[PDB]
Design a protein around this ligand. Structure first.
Ligand SMILES: *C(=O)CC(C)(C)C(=O)O
Ligand SMILES: [Zn+2]
Lengths: 262, 8
């Protein structure tokens, strides 16, 4: 029931919103995972690993280049906006709203969200392999060598780019090789962030799960913290709930969420 | 540290 939720919503002083791949999906962003989510011959699991980066750094960067470029045509959907505006609106009133997102596309930032935690990092940040500096980067193309590369059709030629022409650290005493600042499979989440997210989720008196379920990573790491405090949790996704069952609003977040937050 | 997707 929406009414029930809204009664909580109106009372809430510290809302936490966890967002999953669903909300990026409704903006037409490919995640490259599961049925027909392919890039060339590969899926994300095959390429989003440090081993792939070690074995074939050109190929991986081609993949991330493409992904960076396809963001130029994908915009924030109404779910991103409603969240951002909600944040803005509640901040005015001394009520907080934080976003904890698994998504690496910056769509919440482009919707105008401010207190956002990117637990898997971002396509538009680099980390230097030598010195470790994390820098914001939105260049198009990120480096010349990759101009016009990264085509998806399975039959494309590899650009087989020499390693020194892929993006390189600018602090030139260094010149290290850059990688996408994202958490690859088989890597850990940065623990400074998890400690901040912990702190937020404890403060929180309403929790939203959007475009994913609490019964699965990453929402699962935390929703129990919050549910064991008696805090209500509301899921918005396109998963079905059995005939026989805290709050769950089936449908697109684009449709469900903005009415809910108004 | 927390393995992404719990290492699945
Ligand atoms: C992990 O979620 C995989 C990410 C999103 C980092 C990727 O697709 O590279
Ligand atoms: Zn460097």
């Amino acid at each position: 029931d929406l009414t029930a939720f809204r009664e909580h919503f109106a009372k809430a002083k510290h809302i936490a919103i966890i967002t999953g791949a669903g909300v990026s999906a409704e903006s037409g962003v490919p995640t490259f995972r599961g049925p027909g989510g392919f890039w060339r011959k590969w899926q994300a699991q095959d390429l989003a690993t440090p081993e792939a980066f070690s074995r074939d750094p050109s190929l991986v960067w081609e993949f991330y280049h493409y992904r960076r470029e396809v963001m130029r045509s994908k915009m924030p959907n109404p779910a991103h906006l409603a969240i951002a505006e909600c944040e803005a609106r509640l901040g005015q009133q001394g009520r907080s709203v934080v976003i904890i997102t698994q998504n690496i596309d910056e769509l919440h930032h482009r919707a105008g969200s401010k207190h956002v935690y990117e637990i898997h990092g971002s396509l538009f940040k680099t980390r230097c392999m030598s010195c470790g500096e994390v820098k914001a980067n939105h260049k198009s193309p990120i480096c010349p060598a990759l101009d016009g590369k990264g085509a998806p059709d399975p039959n494309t030629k590899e650009a087989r780019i020499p390693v020194e022409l892929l993006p390189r650290c600018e602090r030139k005493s260094c010149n290290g090789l850059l990688r996408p600042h994202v958490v690859w499979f088989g890597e850990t989440l940065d623990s400074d962030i998890l400690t901040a997210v912990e702190r937020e989720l404890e403060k929180c008196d309403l929790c939203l799960v959007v475009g994913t379920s609490s019964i699965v990573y990453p929402a699962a790491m935390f929703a129990p913290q919050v549910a064991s405090r008696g805090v209500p949790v509301a899921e918005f996704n396109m998963e079905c709930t059995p005939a026989t069952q805290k709050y769950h609003f089936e449908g697109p977040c684009g449709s469900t969420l903005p009415p809910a937050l108004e | 540290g927390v393995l992404k997707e719990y290492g699945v």
